[PDB]
Structures are given as structure tokens and as C-alpha cells.
Amino acid sequence: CKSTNSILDSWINIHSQAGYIHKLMSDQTYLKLINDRLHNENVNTNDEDG
Amino acid sequence: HNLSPLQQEVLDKYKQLSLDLKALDETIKELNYSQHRQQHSQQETVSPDEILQEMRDIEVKIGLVGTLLKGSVYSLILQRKQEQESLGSNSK
């Protein structure tokens, strides 16, 4: 029973992280920001502060 | 108080019987002690840590594995049925 519980808490952790990052991927603004961040790093990787 | 030899044999047999009687009573109790890690012990004795406190702990989250798949499939079927009845009733 204890081992089953441990497996289930591992599943719980996985699904919690899945939900958080799904919330992240839900917002279009953050994805746009990381997209032009990728393009900026393509043109200039130095300006991380930008 | 002198006694017949048969009576004395009955008596000390009764004594031994009482001895393993309270021995078995102590054993059954020790099984029933929920004193797991409360008294000096490191073995689990059948108690809520084997029952609802534990099995229910499992159960409040096992539904997230088994019954939730069904529930999702049933919800899709229910939505499909809703769409079908709406279209059928409104089209005619």
C-alpha cells in the first residue's frame, strides 16, 4: 500500500507540473516573447537583458 | 486440602490452559494495538495505517487514474448526445 501511494504521489507531481506548464503555454504573450527572444539570439545572443 | 490424583491432573492442566489462554489473548491484543511506532515497536499491526487512513489515502487519488479516464470518455459521449438531440429536435 505504501509503494502504491508513492507511485501515486509521483503521478501527482507529474500532473501538477503538466498543469503549470500548460498554464504557461496558454498565454500567447509569453510564447511571443520567447519567440522573438529566439530570433534576437539568432541576430544577437549577447543582449539577454533585452 | 487433599485431592484425588485425577482431580490434581485436571487442575494443573487447567493451569496450563489458562496460561496459553492469556498468551493468546496478549497475541490478539498485540495484533489489535494501533500503537504502531507509538509504543516501542517497528512493525505494523493492523490498524488505520492499514485501513481507511491508508487505503482511503490511496483511494482519494486512485480515482485520478482509473475513474477519471472513464469520466472523460463519458463526458465526451454526453456532449455528443447533447449535440445529436439538439440537431435532431431543432432540424425537424
Side-chain angles (χ1 to χ4, degrees):
Chain A
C1 296
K2 183 159 59 81
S3 52
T4 307
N5 259 319
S6 311
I7 284 162
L8 291 162
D9 325 291
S10 93
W11 195 284
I12 291 273
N13 309 325
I14 281 174
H15 262 251
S16 317
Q17 312 321 321
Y20 285 116
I21 76 175
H22 175 286
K23 288 269 286 308
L24 277 182
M25 301 175 358
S26 309
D27 166 63
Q28 196 58 221
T29 324
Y30 168 55
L31 306 178
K32 265 297 311 180
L33 181 59
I34 195 168
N35 198 0
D36 54 332
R37 174 231 70 93
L38 172 136
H39 291 300
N40 181 17
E41 297 256 346
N42 301 342
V43 304
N44 188 22
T45 181
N46 174 57
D47 42 335
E48 164 273 327
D49 193 348
Chain B
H1 272 187
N2 71 280
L3 294 170
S4 94
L6 255 66
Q7 292 153 18
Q8 199 59 84
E9 181 272 323
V10 165
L11 265 281
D12 41 11
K13 181 147 196 83
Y14 267 53
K15 295 294 133 299
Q16 176 268 148
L17 169 68
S18 171
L19 298 152
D20 43 0
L21 258 286
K22 332 162 279 303
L24 171 132
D25 177 272
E26 184 39 358
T27 316
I28 269 66
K29 284 206 60 34
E30 191 46 286
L31 252 188
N32 224 67
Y33 284 55
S34 309
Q35 301 285 334
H36 187 19
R37 278 200 173 289
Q38 293 135 70
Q39 83 198 153
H40 148 57
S41 56
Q42 307 179 357
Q43 85 302 331
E44 148 59 1
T45 49
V46 50
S47 54
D49 44 9
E50 190 51 286
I51 327 164
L52 220 72
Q53 171 296 328
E54 178 55 69
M55 286 260 182
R56 214 71 201 191
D57 173 348
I58 281 169
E59 172 264 353
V60 313
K61 66 189 69 159
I62 207 184
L64 175 161
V65 182
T67 207
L68 253 54
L69 271 41
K70 313 211 170 82
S72 94
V73 170
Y74 194 71
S75 96
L76 178 58
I77 288 287
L78 151 73
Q79 207 211 289
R80 189 64 42 79
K81 162 28 54 63
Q82 181 173 36
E83 302 140 28
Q84 288 315 298
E85 55 81 20
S86 58
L87 298 153
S89 63
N90 292 291
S91 194
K92 301 166 192 180

